[PDB]
Amino acid sequence: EKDDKDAIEEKFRERLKELVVPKHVMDVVDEELSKLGLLDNHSSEFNVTRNYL
Amino acid sequence: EKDDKDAIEEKFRERLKELVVPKHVMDVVDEELSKLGLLDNHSSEFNVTRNYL
Question: Residue A22 — φ and ψ, nearest 5°?
């Protein structure tokens, strides 16, 4: 289930609201959020996605 | 025998019980323990994290 991940990624979003993130960063942030939802976050390449995020 | 992950997890927990594990170290152990259960028993990655654990 992605409900636990949805809560985890939401915690990342709320802290992001306290800083004025540049628009160019949003493209990487949004694509990493999408990549986070399509991966189980348990693998060699799965962990680096949240690590980058 | 019983489940390998359950036996491995129980034995590793007892070893960490005596030591005053730091907060960040505990998170690293906890996250790899969760991925240990879902990993295949004969998988090569299973041995990699088992030695790391």
Answer: -65, 155
Q: Which two tokens stand for residue A19?
A: 């800083």
Give the best residue of A5, A42, A45 to mutate against chain B (max B CB count within 10 A): A42
Resolution in A: 2.8
- Expt. technique: cryo-EM
∠ CA A40-A38-A51, nearest 5°, is: 60
**Does A1 lie at the interface with B, CB-CB under 8 angstroms?**
no
Alpha carbon dihedral B34, B35, B37, B42, in 10-degree steps, equals -160
